[PDB]
Amino acid sequence: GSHMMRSPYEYHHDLGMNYTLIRDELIVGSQPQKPEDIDHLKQEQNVAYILNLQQDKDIEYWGIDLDSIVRRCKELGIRHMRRPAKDFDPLSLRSQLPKAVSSLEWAVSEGKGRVYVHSSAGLGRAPGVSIAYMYWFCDMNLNTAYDTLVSKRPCGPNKGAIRGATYDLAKNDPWKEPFESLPENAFEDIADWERKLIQERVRALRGT
Ligand SMILES: OC[C@H]1O[C@H](O[C@H]2[C@H](O)[C@@H](O)[C@@H](O[C@H]3[C@H](O)[C@@H](O)[C@@H](O[C@H]4[C@H](O)[C@@H](O)[C@@H](O[C@H]5[C@H](O)[C@@H](O)[C@@H](O[C@H]6[C@H](O)[C@@H](O)[C@@H](O)O[C@@H]6CO)O[C@@H]5CO)O[C@@H]4CO)O[C@@H]3CO)O[C@@H]2CO)[C@H](O)[C@@H](O)[C@@H]1O
Ligand SMILES: OC[C@H]1O[C@H](O[C@H]2[C@H](O)[C@@H](O)[C@@H](O[C@H]3[C@H](O)[C@@H](O)[C@@H](O[C@H]4[C@H](O)[C@@H](O)[C@@H](O[C@H]5[C@H](O)[C@@H](O)[C@@H](O[C@H]6[C@H](O)[C@@H](O)[C@@H](O)O[C@@H]6CO)O[C@@H]5CO)O[C@@H]4CO)O[C@@H]3CO)O[C@@H]2CO)[C@H](O)[C@@H](O)[C@@H]1O
Ligand SMILES: OC[C@H]1O[C@H](O[C@H]2[C@H](O)[C@@H](O)[C@@H](O[C@H]3[C@H](O)[C@@H](O)[C@@H](O[C@H]4[C@H](O)[C@@H](O)[C@@H](O[C@H]5[C@H](O)[C@@H](O)[C@@H](O)O[C@@H]5CO)O[C@@H]4CO)O[C@@H]3CO)O[C@@H]2CO)[C@H](O)[C@@H](O)[C@@H]1O
Ligand SMILES: OC[C@H]1O[C@H](O[C@H]2[C@H](O)[C@@H](O)[C@@H](O[C@H]3[C@H](O)[C@@H](O)[C@@H](O[C@H]4[C@H](O)[C@@H](O)[C@@H](O[C@H]5[C@H](O)[C@@H](O)[C@@H](O)O[C@@H]5CO)O[C@@H]4CO)O[C@@H]3CO)O[C@@H]2CO)[C@H](O)[C@@H](O)[C@@H]1O
């Protein structure tokens, strides 16, 4: 009916799982709600991996029977991966970014089909993870990676968290140069050695 918009971006769980193709290897969207959403993704999008960024309490709140989703994945040869991060929490997204990205980049490199990256709405966590991936592993800077995502799938993923994760992986002696004491554009882009260091540390998180 008639209604003021709660916030700038709203999650309409009642409209079913939604998603957006961002690059050919990479889909970002909301939680699959049923085993049938897995079949959809296999049949329509050649998805061979699911990266789920939700906590257990998210999954309980949204009433999802994750065991049956995961069972369907196994039946269809899809690999289902969990890397939880807190909802509405940019410091949690930041802390978990490197592990989440290692799972996504591993899957893309394995090459069996597309990767479906999701959180609850795919408005916060999953877009952040995807933007970090395109920045660190697809030879862009942070602003270009950010716009690649939000121009296709509008939302306000937290840029500071991604930039802060880039610092966490790349900066020598952080205690000497705290993130908060550095110019705001710091680590919006990276030198070649930094890009190589970040990639080595991310790939070394594989299977951890
Ligand atoms: O109930 C929830 C569920 O949660 C846990 O399982 C999840 C797990 O936490 C989560 O990471 C993910 O698992 C993914 C992973 O993120 C992906 O990256 C991918 O892992 C493969 C990896 O990319 C490959 O490199 C390969 O891993 C090799 C390593 O390269 C080797 O070095 C060696 O790793 C060992 C490592 O050196 C040590 O530090 C030590 O940490 O142990 C490591 C392994 O013992 O071996 C591994 C191979 O074992 O192969 C990986 C492919 O298998 O794919 C993973 C998905 O399978 O998602 C999980 C699912 O939610 C929890 O652990 C579950 O029990 C729990 O049910
Ligand atoms: O630039 C625009 C916009 O960008 C940013 O907003 C983004 C936001 O930060 C990001 O987290 C996301 O927001 C999503 C959210 O991730 C989704 O999950 C969905 O939210 C619904 C959620 O799934 C439900 O569980 C429910 O949340 C309830 C909780 O169940 C309650 O417990 C309570 O949680 C509060 C908790 O007690 C506190 O500890 C703390 O965690 O705060 C929590 C909430 O403040 O309340 C919430 C809500 O009342 O219902 C949720 C529906 O609201 O949908 C969200 C989008 O609507 O995506 C955003 C956009 O990309 C930026 O941060 C903003 O400032 C900026 O305006
Ligand atoms: O040897 C490697 C490298 O060394 C030298 O570069 C160093 C610079 O000389 C030194 O000044 C320092 O550069 C700073 C810069 O001073 C500072 O302004 C900041 O740069 C900002 C820009 O000011 C800002 O406009 C924006 O840049 C945009 C850019 O306009 C746009 O064209 C596009 O390409 O993307 C950019 C945004 O991603 O933001 C940047 C920062 O994000 O920060 C710099 C910090 O490093 O440090 C350099 C360190 O190497 C040589 O001059 C150089 O040619 C050598 O290759
Ligand atoms: O505004 C006009 C500006 O233009 C010219 O600078 C340009 C550089 O010459 C050019 O190379 C490019 O800068 C790149 C940079 O080379 C690249 O290394 C990267 O910079 C990163 C650092 O890698 C990263 O470590 C981090 O730097 C921190 C640093 O760790 C910290 O200790 C302290 O020094 O603060 C730094 C933050 O400034 O962050 C930056 C990323 O922000 O990416 C850079 C941006 O693309 O572009 C420069 C600007 O266009 C002229 O040389 C210069 O004199 C003029 O000021």
CSV table of C-alpha atoms and ligand atoms in Angstrom, one decimal:
chain,number,residue,atom,x,y,z
A,1,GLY,CA,0.0,0.0,0.0
A,2,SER,CA,1.0,3.7,0.4
A,3,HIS,CA,4.4,3.9,2.3
A,4,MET,CA,7.3,6.2,3.0
A,5,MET,CA,10.6,4.5,2.1
A,6,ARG,CA,12.2,3.1,5.3
A,7,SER,CA,15.8,3.6,4.1
A,8,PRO,CA,17.6,4.4,0.8
A,9,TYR,CA,18.0,0.7,-0.1
A,10,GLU,CA,15.3,-1.8,1.2
A,11,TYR,CA,15.5,-5.6,1.2
A,12,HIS,CA,12.3,-7.0,-0.2
A,13,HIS,CA,12.6,-10.6,1.1
A,14,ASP,CA,9.0,-11.2,0.0
A,15,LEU,CA,10.0,-10.8,-3.7
A,16,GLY,CA,12.3,-13.8,-3.6
A,17,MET,CA,16.0,-14.2,-4.1
A,18,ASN,CA,17.4,-11.4,-6.4
A,19,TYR,CA,20.8,-11.0,-8.0
A,20,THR,CA,23.0,-9.2,-10.5
A,21,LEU,CA,25.8,-10.4,-12.8
A,22,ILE,CA,28.7,-8.2,-12.2
A,23,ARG,CA,31.4,-9.9,-14.2
A,24,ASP,CA,31.2,-13.2,-16.1
A,25,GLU,CA,32.6,-15.2,-13.2
A,26,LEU,CA,30.7,-13.3,-10.5
A,27,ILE,CA,27.1,-12.9,-9.3
A,28,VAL,CA,26.1,-10.9,-6.3
A,29,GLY,CA,22.6,-11.2,-4.7
A,30,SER,CA,20.4,-12.1,-1.8
A,31,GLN,CA,20.0,-15.3,0.1
A,32,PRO,CA,18.6,-18.3,-1.7
A,33,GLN,CA,15.4,-19.0,0.3
A,34,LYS,CA,14.7,-22.6,-0.8
A,35,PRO,CA,16.4,-25.6,-2.4
A,36,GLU,CA,14.6,-24.6,-5.6
A,37,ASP,CA,16.7,-21.3,-5.7
A,38,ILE,CA,19.8,-23.5,-6.0
A,39,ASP,CA,18.2,-25.3,-9.1
A,40,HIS,CA,17.4,-21.9,-10.5
A,41,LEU,CA,21.0,-20.8,-10.3
A,42,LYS,CA,22.4,-24.0,-11.7
A,43,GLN,CA,20.0,-24.1,-14.7
A,44,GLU,CA,19.8,-20.4,-15.5
A,45,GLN,CA,23.3,-19.1,-14.5
A,46,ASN,CA,25.8,-22.0,-14.5
A,47,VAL,CA,26.6,-21.4,-10.9
A,48,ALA,CA,29.0,-23.9,-9.4
A,49,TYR,CA,29.9,-22.1,-6.2
A,50,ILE,CA,27.9,-20.4,-3.4
A,51,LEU,CA,29.7,-18.1,-1.0
A,52,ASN,CA,27.4,-17.4,1.9
A,53,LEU,CA,28.5,-14.5,4.2
A,54,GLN,CA,25.7,-14.8,6.8
A,55,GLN,CA,25.8,-15.5,10.5
A,56,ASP,CA,23.7,-18.3,12.0
A,57,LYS,CA,21.4,-15.7,13.6
A,58,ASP,CA,20.8,-14.1,10.2
A,59,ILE,CA,19.8,-17.5,8.9
A,60,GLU,CA,17.4,-18.2,11.8
A,61,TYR,CA,15.8,-14.8,11.6
A,62,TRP,CA,14.9,-15.3,7.9
A,63,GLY,CA,13.7,-18.8,8.6
A,64,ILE,CA,16.0,-20.6,6.2
A,65,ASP,CA,16.5,-24.3,6.3
A,66,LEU,CA,20.2,-24.2,5.4
A,67,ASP,CA,20.7,-28.0,5.7
A,68,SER,CA,18.3,-28.6,2.8
A,69,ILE,CA,19.9,-25.8,0.7
A,70,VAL,CA,23.3,-27.3,1.3
A,71,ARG,CA,22.0,-30.9,0.5
A,72,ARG,CA,20.6,-29.6,-2.8
A,73,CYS,CA,24.0,-28.0,-3.6
A,74,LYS,CA,25.7,-31.3,-3.0
A,75,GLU,CA,23.2,-33.1,-5.2
A,76,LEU,CA,23.8,-30.7,-8.1
A,77,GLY,CA,27.6,-30.7,-7.8
A,78,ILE,CA,27.7,-27.1,-6.4
A,79,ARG,CA,30.1,-26.2,-3.8
A,80,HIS,CA,28.6,-24.2,-0.8
A,81,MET,CA,31.0,-22.1,1.2
A,82,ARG,CA,30.5,-20.2,4.5
A,83,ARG,CA,32.4,-17.2,5.6
A,84,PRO,CA,30.2,-15.3,8.2
A,85,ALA,CA,30.4,-11.6,8.9
A,86,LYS,CA,28.2,-9.5,11.2
A,87,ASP,CA,25.2,-7.7,9.7
A,88,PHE,CA,25.3,-3.9,9.9
A,89,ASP,CA,28.9,-4.0,11.0
A,90,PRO,CA,31.7,-2.5,8.8
A,91,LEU,CA,34.5,-3.5,11.3
A,92,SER,CA,33.3,-7.1,11.1
A,93,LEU,CA,33.2,-6.9,7.3
A,94,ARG,CA,36.7,-5.5,7.3
A,95,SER,CA,38.1,-8.2,9.6
A,96,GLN,CA,36.5,-11.0,7.6
A,97,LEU,CA,37.2,-9.5,4.1
A,98,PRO,CA,40.5,-11.4,3.4
A,99,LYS,CA,39.1,-14.9,4.3
A,100,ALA,CA,35.9,-14.2,2.3
A,101,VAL,CA,37.9,-13.0,-0.7
A,102,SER,CA,40.2,-16.1,-0.5
A,103,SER,CA,37.2,-18.4,-0.9
A,104,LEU,CA,35.8,-16.3,-3.9
A,105,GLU,CA,39.1,-15.9,-5.8
A,106,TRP,CA,39.8,-19.6,-5.2
A,107,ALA,CA,36.5,-20.6,-6.7
A,108,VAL,CA,36.9,-18.3,-9.8
A,109,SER,CA,40.4,-19.7,-10.3
A,110,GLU,CA,39.0,-23.3,-10.0
A,111,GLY,CA,36.8,-22.4,-13.0
A,112,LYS,CA,34.0,-25.0,-12.8
A,113,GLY,CA,31.2,-22.3,-13.3
A,114,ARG,CA,30.0,-19.1,-11.8
A,115,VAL,CA,30.3,-18.0,-8.2
A,116,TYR,CA,27.2,-16.8,-6.4
A,117,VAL,CA,28.2,-14.4,-3.6
A,118,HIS,CA,25.4,-13.5,-1.1
A,119,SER,CA,24.6,-12.3,2.3
A,120,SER,CA,21.0,-11.6,3.6
A,121,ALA,CA,20.0,-8.8,1.1
A,122,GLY,CA,23.2,-8.6,-0.9
A,123,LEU,CA,23.3,-4.9,-0.2
A,124,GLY,CA,26.2,-4.8,2.3
A,125,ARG,CA,28.4,-7.8,2.8
A,126,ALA,CA,28.3,-9.5,-0.5
A,127,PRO,CA,28.9,-6.3,-2.5
A,128,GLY,CA,31.8,-5.4,-0.2
A,129,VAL,CA,33.4,-8.8,-0.7
A,130,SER,CA,32.9,-8.6,-4.5
A,131,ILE,CA,34.4,-5.1,-4.7
A,132,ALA,CA,37.5,-6.1,-2.7
A,133,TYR,CA,38.0,-9.0,-5.1
A,134,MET,CA,37.8,-6.8,-8.3
A,135,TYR,CA,40.2,-4.3,-6.7
A,136,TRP,CA,42.8,-6.8,-5.4
A,137,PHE,CA,42.6,-9.4,-8.2
A,138,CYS,CA,41.1,-7.7,-11.3
A,139,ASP,CA,43.7,-4.8,-11.8
A,140,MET,CA,41.5,-1.9,-10.8
A,141,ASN,CA,41.7,0.7,-8.1
A,142,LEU,CA,39.2,0.9,-5.3
A,143,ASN,CA,36.9,3.6,-6.8
A,144,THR,CA,36.6,1.8,-10.2
A,145,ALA,CA,35.8,-1.5,-8.4
A,146,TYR,CA,33.2,0.2,-6.3
A,147,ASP,CA,31.4,1.8,-9.3
A,148,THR,CA,31.6,-1.4,-11.3
A,149,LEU,CA,29.5,-2.9,-8.6
A,150,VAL,CA,27.1,-0.1,-7.5
A,151,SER,CA,26.3,1.0,-11.1
A,152,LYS,CA,25.0,-2.5,-11.9
A,153,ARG,CA,23.6,-3.2,-8.4
A,154,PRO,CA,22.8,-0.1,-6.5
A,155,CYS,CA,23.6,-0.1,-2.7
A,156,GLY,CA,25.9,1.6,-0.2
A,157,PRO,CA,28.6,-1.0,0.8
A,158,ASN,CA,31.1,0.5,3.2
A,159,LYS,CA,34.1,1.8,1.3
A,160,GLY,CA,36.1,2.5,4.5
A,161,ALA,CA,36.0,-1.2,5.4
A,162,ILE,CA,37.4,-2.3,2.0
A,163,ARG,CA,40.2,0.4,2.1
A,164,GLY,CA,40.9,-0.6,5.8
A,165,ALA,CA,41.2,-4.2,4.7
A,166,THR,CA,43.6,-3.2,2.0
A,167,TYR,CA,45.7,-1.4,4.7
A,168,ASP,CA,45.5,-4.4,7.0
A,169,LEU,CA,47.1,-6.7,4.3
A,170,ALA,CA,49.5,-4.2,2.8
A,171,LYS,CA,50.9,-1.7,5.3
A,172,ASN,CA,54.3,-2.2,7.0
A,173,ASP,CA,54.1,-1.8,10.9
A,174,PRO,CA,50.5,-0.6,11.3
A,175,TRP,CA,51.1,0.4,14.9
A,176,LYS,CA,53.5,3.0,13.6
A,177,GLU,CA,51.0,4.4,11.1
A,178,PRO,CA,47.5,3.8,12.3
A,179,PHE,CA,44.7,3.7,9.7
A,180,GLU,CA,42.9,6.6,11.5
A,181,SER,CA,46.1,8.8,11.3
A,182,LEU,CA,46.4,8.5,7.5
A,183,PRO,CA,44.9,10.6,4.7
A,184,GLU,CA,41.4,9.5,3.7
A,185,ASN,CA,42.5,8.5,0.2
A,186,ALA,CA,45.2,6.1,1.5
A,187,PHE,CA,45.0,2.6,-0.1
A,188,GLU,CA,42.3,3.7,-2.6
A,189,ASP,CA,45.0,2.3,-4.9
A,190,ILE,CA,48.1,0.2,-4.5
A,191,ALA,CA,51.6,-0.2,-5.9
A,192,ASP,CA,52.7,-3.4,-7.7
A,193,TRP,CA,54.5,-4.9,-4.6
A,194,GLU,CA,51.4,-4.2,-2.5
A,195,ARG,CA,49.1,-5.9,-5.0
A,196,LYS,CA,51.4,-8.9,-5.1
A,197,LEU,CA,51.7,-9.0,-1.2
A,198,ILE,CA,47.9,-8.8,-0.8
A,199,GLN,CA,47.3,-11.6,-3.3
A,200,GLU,CA,49.9,-13.9,-1.6
A,201,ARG,CA,48.3,-13.3,1.8
A,202,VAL,CA,44.8,-13.8,0.5
A,203,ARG,CA,45.7,-17.1,-1.4
A,204,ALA,CA,47.5,-18.4,1.7
A,205,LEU,CA,44.1,-18.3,3.5
A,206,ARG,CA,42.8,-21.0,1.2
A,207,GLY,CA,41.1,-23.8,3.1
A,208,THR,CA,41.8,-22.1,6.5
B,1,LIG,O1,28.8,-25.8,9.3
B,1,LIG,C1,29.5,-24.7,8.6
B,1,LIG,C2,30.8,-25.3,8.1
B,1,LIG,O2,31.8,-24.3,8.3
B,1,LIG,C3,33.1,-24.7,8.1
B,1,LIG,O3,33.4,-25.1,6.7
B,1,LIG,C4,33.5,-24.0,5.9
B,1,LIG,C5,34.9,-23.4,5.9
B,1,LIG,O4,35.0,-22.7,7.1
B,1,LIG,C6,35.0,-22.3,4.9
B,1,LIG,O5,36.3,-21.9,4.9
B,1,LIG,C7,34.5,-22.7,3.5
B,1,LIG,O6,35.5,-23.7,3.1
B,1,LIG,C8,35.9,-23.5,1.7
B,1,LIG,C9,37.1,-22.5,1.6
B,1,LIG,O7,36.7,-21.2,2.1
B,1,LIG,C10,37.4,-22.5,0.1
B,1,LIG,O8,38.5,-21.6,-0.1
B,1,LIG,C11,37.7,-23.9,-0.5
B,1,LIG,O9,38.8,-24.5,0.2
B,1,LIG,C12,39.7,-25.1,-0.7
B,1,LIG,C13,41.0,-24.3,-0.8
B,1,LIG,O10,40.6,-23.1,-1.4
B,1,LIG,C14,42.0,-25.1,-1.5
B,1,LIG,O11,43.3,-24.4,-1.4
B,1,LIG,C15,42.2,-26.5,-0.9
B,1,LIG,O12,42.7,-26.3,0.5
B,1,LIG,C16,43.8,-27.0,0.8
B,1,LIG,C17,45.0,-26.1,1.2
B,1,LIG,O13,45.4,-25.3,0.1
B,1,LIG,C18,46.1,-26.8,1.9
B,1,LIG,O14,47.1,-25.8,2.3
B,1,LIG,C19,45.6,-27.5,3.1
B,1,LIG,O15,45.0,-26.5,3.9
B,1,LIG,C20,45.2,-26.7,5.3
B,1,LIG,C21,46.0,-25.5,5.8
B,1,LIG,O16,47.3,-25.5,5.2
B,1,LIG,C22,46.1,-25.4,7.3
B,1,LIG,O17,46.3,-24.1,7.7
B,1,LIG,C23,44.8,-25.9,8.0
B,1,LIG,O18,44.0,-24.7,8.1
B,1,LIG,O19,44.1,-26.9,7.4
B,1,LIG,C24,43.9,-26.7,6.0
B,1,LIG,C25,43.1,-27.8,5.5
B,1,LIG,O20,43.2,-28.8,6.5
B,1,LIG,O21,44.6,-28.4,2.7
B,1,LIG,C26,43.4,-27.8,2.0
B,1,LIG,C27,42.5,-29.0,1.6
B,1,LIG,O22,42.0,-29.5,2.8
B,1,LIG,O23,41.0,-27.2,-0.9
B,1,LIG,C28,39.9,-26.6,-0.3
B,1,LIG,C29,38.8,-27.4,-1.0
B,1,LIG,O24,38.4,-28.4,-0.1
B,1,LIG,O25,36.5,-24.7,-0.3
B,1,LIG,C30,36.1,-24.8,1.0
B,1,LIG,C31,34.8,-25.5,1.0
B,1,LIG,O26,35.0,-26.9,1.0
B,1,LIG,O27,33.3,-23.3,3.6
B,1,LIG,C32,33.1,-24.4,4.4
B,1,LIG,C33,31.6,-24.9,4.3
B,1,LIG,O28,30.8,-24.1,5.1
B,1,LIG,C34,33.5,-25.9,9.0
B,1,LIG,O29,34.8,-26.2,8.8
B,1,LIG,C35,32.6,-27.1,8.5
B,1,LIG,O30,32.9,-28.3,9.1
B,1,LIG,C36,31.2,-26.6,8.8
B,1,LIG,O31,30.2,-27.6,8.5
B,2,LIG,O1,24.1,4.7,1.7
B,2,LIG,C1,22.8,4.2,2.0
B,2,LIG,C2,23.0,3.4,3.2
B,2,LIG,O2,24.2,2.6,3.1
B,2,LIG,C3,24.5,1.9,4.2
B,2,LIG,O3,23.4,1.0,4.6
B,2,LIG,C4,23.6,-0.3,4.3
B,2,LIG,C5,23.7,-1.1,5.6
B,2,LIG,O4,24.7,-0.5,6.5
B,2,LIG,C6,23.9,-2.6,5.4
B,2,LIG,O5,24.1,-3.2,6.6
B,2,LIG,C7,22.7,-3.1,4.6
B,2,LIG,O6,21.5,-3.0,5.4
B,2,LIG,C8,20.7,-4.1,5.1
B,2,LIG,C9,20.9,-5.3,6.1
B,2,LIG,O7,22.3,-5.7,5.9
B,2,LIG,C10,19.9,-6.4,5.7
B,2,LIG,O8,20.1,-7.6,6.5
B,2,LIG,C11,18.5,-5.9,5.8
B,2,LIG,O9,18.2,-5.7,7.1
B,2,LIG,C12,17.2,-6.4,7.7
B,2,LIG,C13,17.7,-7.5,8.5
B,2,LIG,O10,18.2,-8.6,7.7
B,2,LIG,C14,16.8,-8.0,9.6
B,2,LIG,O11,17.4,-8.9,10.5
B,2,LIG,C15,16.2,-6.9,10.4
B,2,LIG,O12,17.2,-6.2,11.1
B,2,LIG,C16,16.8,-5.7,12.4
B,2,LIG,C17,17.4,-6.7,13.4
B,2,LIG,O13,16.8,-8.0,13.3
B,2,LIG,C18,17.2,-6.1,14.8
B,2,LIG,O14,17.8,-6.9,15.8
B,2,LIG,C19,17.8,-4.7,14.9
B,2,LIG,O15,19.2,-4.9,14.7
B,2,LIG,C20,19.9,-3.9,15.4
B,2,LIG,C21,20.8,-4.4,16.5
B,2,LIG,O16,20.1,-4.6,17.7
B,2,LIG,C22,22.0,-3.5,16.8
B,2,LIG,O17,22.9,-4.3,17.5
B,2,LIG,C23,22.7,-3.1,15.5
B,2,LIG,O18,23.1,-4.3,14.8
B,2,LIG,O19,21.7,-2.4,14.7
B,2,LIG,C24,20.7,-3.2,14.2
B,2,LIG,C25,19.8,-2.4,13.4
B,2,LIG,O20,20.2,-1.0,13.6
B,2,LIG,O21,17.2,-3.9,13.9
B,2,LIG,C26,17.3,-4.3,12.6
B,2,LIG,C27,16.5,-3.3,11.7
B,2,LIG,O22,15.6,-2.6,12.6
B,2,LIG,O23,15.5,-6.1,9.5
B,2,LIG,C28,16.4,-5.4,8.6
B,2,LIG,C29,15.7,-4.4,7.8
B,2,LIG,O24,16.1,-3.2,8.3
B,2,LIG,O25,18.3,-4.8,5.0
B,2,LIG,C30,19.2,-3.7,5.2
B,2,LIG,C31,18.8,-2.6,4.1
B,2,LIG,O26,17.5,-2.1,4.4
B,2,LIG,O27,22.6,-2.3,3.3
B,2,LIG,C32,22.5,-0.9,3.4
B,2,LIG,C33,22.5,-0.3,2.0
B,2,LIG,O28,23.5,-0.7,1.0
B,2,LIG,C34,24.8,2.8,5.3
B,2,LIG,O29,25.2,2.1,6.5
B,2,LIG,C35,23.6,3.7,5.7
B,2,LIG,O30,24.0,4.7,6.7
B,2,LIG,C36,23.2,4.5,4.4
B,2,LIG,O31,22.1,5.1,4.6
B,3,LIG,O1,58.0,5.1,-7.5
B,3,LIG,C1,56.6,4.9,-7.5
B,3,LIG,C2,56.0,6.3,-7.8
B,3,LIG,O2,56.6,7.2,-7.0
B,3,LIG,C3,56.2,8.6,-7.2
B,3,LIG,O3,54.9,8.8,-6.8
B,3,LIG,C4,54.8,9.2,-5.4
B,3,LIG,C5,54.4,10.7,-5.6
B,3,LIG,O4,55.4,11.4,-6.2
B,3,LIG,C6,54.1,11.2,-4.2
B,3,LIG,O5,53.6,12.6,-4.3
B,3,LIG,C7,53.1,10.4,-3.5
B,3,LIG,O6,51.9,10.5,-4.3
B,3,LIG,C8,50.8,10.9,-3.4
B,3,LIG,C9,50.2,12.1,-3.9
B,3,LIG,O7,51.0,13.2,-3.6
B,3,LIG,C10,48.9,12.3,-3.2
B,3,LIG,O8,48.2,13.4,-3.8
B,3,LIG,C11,48.0,11.1,-3.3
B,3,LIG,O9,47.5,10.9,-4.7
B,3,LIG,C12,46.1,11.1,-4.8
B,3,LIG,C13,45.8,12.2,-5.9
B,3,LIG,O10,46.2,13.4,-5.4
B,3,LIG,C14,44.3,12.2,-6.2
B,3,LIG,O11,44.1,13.1,-7.3
B,3,LIG,C15,43.7,10.8,-6.5
B,3,LIG,O12,44.3,10.2,-7.7
B,3,LIG,C16,43.4,9.7,-8.6
B,3,LIG,C17,43.8,10.2,-10.0
B,3,LIG,O13,43.6,11.6,-10.0
B,3,LIG,C18,43.1,9.5,-11.1
B,3,LIG,O14,43.7,10.0,-12.3
B,3,LIG,C19,43.1,8.0,-11.1
B,3,LIG,O15,44.2,7.5,-11.8
B,3,LIG,O16,43.0,7.5,-9.8
B,3,LIG,C20,43.4,8.1,-8.6
B,3,LIG,C21,42.6,7.6,-7.4
B,3,LIG,O17,42.8,6.2,-7.2
B,3,LIG,O18,44.0,10.0,-5.4
B,3,LIG,C22,45.4,9.8,-5.1
B,3,LIG,C23,45.5,8.7,-4.0
B,3,LIG,O19,44.5,7.7,-4.1
B,3,LIG,O20,48.7,10.0,-2.8
B,3,LIG,C24,49.9,9.6,-3.3
B,3,LIG,C25,50.5,8.6,-2.3
B,3,LIG,O21,51.4,7.7,-2.9
B,3,LIG,O22,53.5,9.0,-3.4
B,3,LIG,C26,53.7,8.4,-4.6
B,3,LIG,C27,54.2,7.0,-4.1
B,3,LIG,O23,54.7,6.2,-5.1
B,3,LIG,C28,56.3,9.0,-8.7
B,3,LIG,O24,55.9,10.4,-8.9
B,3,LIG,C29,55.5,8.0,-9.5
B,3,LIG,O25,55.3,8.4,-10.9
B,3,LIG,C30,56.1,6.6,-9.3
B,3,LIG,O26,55.5,5.6,-10.2
B,4,LIG,O1,47.6,15.2,-7.3
B,4,LIG,C1,48.7,15.4,-8.3
B,4,LIG,C2,49.8,14.4,-7.9
B,4,LIG,O2,50.2,13.7,-9.1
B,4,LIG,C3,51.3,12.9,-9.1
B,4,LIG,O3,51.2,11.7,-8.2
B,4,LIG,C4,50.8,10.6,-8.8
B,4,LIG,C5,51.8,9.5,-8.7
B,4,LIG,O4,53.0,9.9,-9.4
B,4,LIG,C6,51.3,8.3,-9.4
B,4,LIG,O5,52.3,7.3,-9.3
B,4,LIG,C7,50.0,7.8,-8.7
B,4,LIG,O6,50.1,7.4,-7.4
B,4,LIG,C8,49.7,6.1,-7.0
B,4,LIG,C9,50.9,5.4,-6.4
B,4,LIG,O7,52.1,5.5,-7.2
B,4,LIG,C10,50.6,4.0,-5.9
B,4,LIG,O8,51.8,3.5,-5.2
B,4,LIG,C11,49.4,4.1,-5.0
B,4,LIG,O9,49.6,4.9,-3.8
B,4,LIG,C12,49.2,4.3,-2.6
B,4,LIG,C13,50.4,3.8,-1.8
B,4,LIG,O10,50.8,2.7,-2.5
B,4,LIG,C14,49.9,3.2,-0.5
B,4,LIG,O11,51.0,2.6,0.2
B,4,LIG,C15,49.2,4.3,0.3
B,4,LIG,O12,50.2,5.3,0.6
B,4,LIG,C16,50.1,5.8,2.0
B,4,LIG,C17,51.4,5.4,2.7
B,4,LIG,O13,51.2,4.0,2.9
B,4,LIG,C18,51.5,6.1,4.0
B,4,LIG,O14,52.6,5.7,4.7
B,4,LIG,C19,51.4,7.6,3.8
B,4,LIG,O15,52.5,8.0,3.0
B,4,LIG,O16,50.3,7.9,3.2
B,4,LIG,C20,50.1,7.3,1.9
B,4,LIG,C21,48.7,7.8,1.4
B,4,LIG,O17,49.0,8.9,0.6
B,4,LIG,O18,48.1,4.9,-0.4
B,4,LIG,C22,48.4,5.3,-1.8
B,4,LIG,C23,47.0,5.3,-2.4
B,4,LIG,O19,46.3,6.3,-1.9
B,4,LIG,O20,48.4,4.6,-5.7
B,4,LIG,C24,48.6,6.0,-6.0
B,4,LIG,C25,47.3,6.7,-6.4
B,4,LIG,O21,46.8,6.4,-7.7
B,4,LIG,O22,49.1,8.9,-8.8
B,4,LIG,C26,49.6,10.0,-8.1
B,4,LIG,C27,48.4,11.0,-8.1
B,4,LIG,O23,47.7,11.0,-9.3
B,4,LIG,C28,52.6,13.7,-8.7
B,4,LIG,O24,53.7,12.9,-8.6
B,4,LIG,C29,52.4,14.3,-7.3
B,4,LIG,O25,53.5,15.1,-7.0
B,4,LIG,C30,51.0,15.2,-7.3
B,4,LIG,O26,50.7,15.4,-5.9
